[PDB]
């Protein structure tokens, strides 16, 4: 349920960015959208924070419990390690999306 | 290295023809000659039909046809807790024993 919510919102924000930049789906060509598009920017930031497990957002009430259950159970050690690394890489690619889509100088056509 | 004179001339002529074709593609003010033959009101008309009629039909189907054969609609039995009142028989499900309370 939680992932449905915030992932749908993230995809909608991505589609809004694509439509605004004339069917451009490359973060290497996006940029400056933090001030170019305020509302989609704040919506995407909120979605990314919820996805990465912000301490009291929608993704906190599922992902945090999932991670605690993985740590506290009779699990495979390699599976637990890969789950933790996957959480870190989730934060990593959310950072990549925000950094290359909203921060910096524009790279879209004039 | 560049257009030959024949290539440039042919391209110019083709461009003129293409632009003329597009201009002809542009429509006329009367071109689509068709043959002769409140918001709350629309919300109300939509709500009565699309919601009211199907719910009427479904309730009639369930109450008088589906719930006429055994086991068609089976509700999970309600949860009964101690210190409760069973409504069918006026029964009193008693409380639990004393708890060994901690702080």
């Amino acid at each position: 349920c939680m992932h449905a919510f915030f992932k749908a919102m993230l995809f909608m924000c991505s589609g809004s960015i694509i439509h605004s930049l004339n069917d451009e789906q490359d973060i290497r060509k996006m940029g400056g959208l933090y001030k170019a598009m305020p509302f989609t920017t704040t919506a995407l930031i909120i979605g990314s924070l919820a996805l990465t497990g912000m301490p009291y957002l929608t993704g906190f009430y599922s992902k945090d419990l999932i991670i605690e259950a993985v740590n506290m159970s009779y699990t495979n050690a390699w599976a637990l390690l890969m789950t933790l690394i996957a959480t870190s890489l989730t934060a990593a690619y959310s950072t990549r999306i925000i950094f290359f889509a909203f921060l910096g100088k524009p790279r879209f056509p004039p | 290295s560049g257009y030959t004179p024949d290539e440039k001339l042919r391209l110019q002529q083709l461009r003129e023809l293409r632009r003329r074709w597009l201009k002809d593609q542009e429509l006329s003010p009367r071109e689509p000659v068709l043959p002769p033959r409140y918001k709350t009101y629309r919300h109300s008309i939509f709500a009565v039909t699309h919601v009211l009629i199907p719910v009427w039909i479904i309730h009639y189907y369930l109450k008088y046809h589906v719930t006429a054969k055994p086991y068609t609609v089976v509700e999970r039995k309600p949860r009964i807790f101690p210190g409760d009142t069973i409504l069918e028989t006026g029964e009193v499900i008693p409380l639990m024993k004393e708890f060994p309370d901690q702080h």
């Binding site: 400056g32 704040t42 930031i45 925000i98 921060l103 524009p106 004039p110 | -």
Partner: protein
């Protein structure tokens, strides 16, 4: 309708990282002729941008004030 292109004489690499690139190239003995055509991006309303930590704190200024006001209201209501 009928938009007009802004005057092309205003695009200058000065004050932008393209000037630093030009200085590096000049030290190398080189020059890049496309400085201004890229310098449209580094001026105007795009000159000031927010860092990643600043982007996450978009509404923290008003959020913290509202939180303090709400905490005070709750404390006063609980007291009386």
């Amino acid at each position: 309708s009928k938009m007009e292109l802004p005057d092309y004489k205003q695009w200058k690499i000065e004050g932008t990282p393209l000037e630093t690139v030009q200085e590096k190239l000049a030290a190398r003995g080189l020059r890049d002729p496309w400085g201004r055509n890229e310098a449209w991006r580094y001026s105007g309303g795009f000159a000031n941008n927010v860092s990643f930590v600043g982007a996450l704190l978009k509404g923290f200024k008003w959020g913290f004030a509202a939180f303090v006001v709400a905490v005070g209201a709750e404390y006063y209501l609980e007291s009386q």
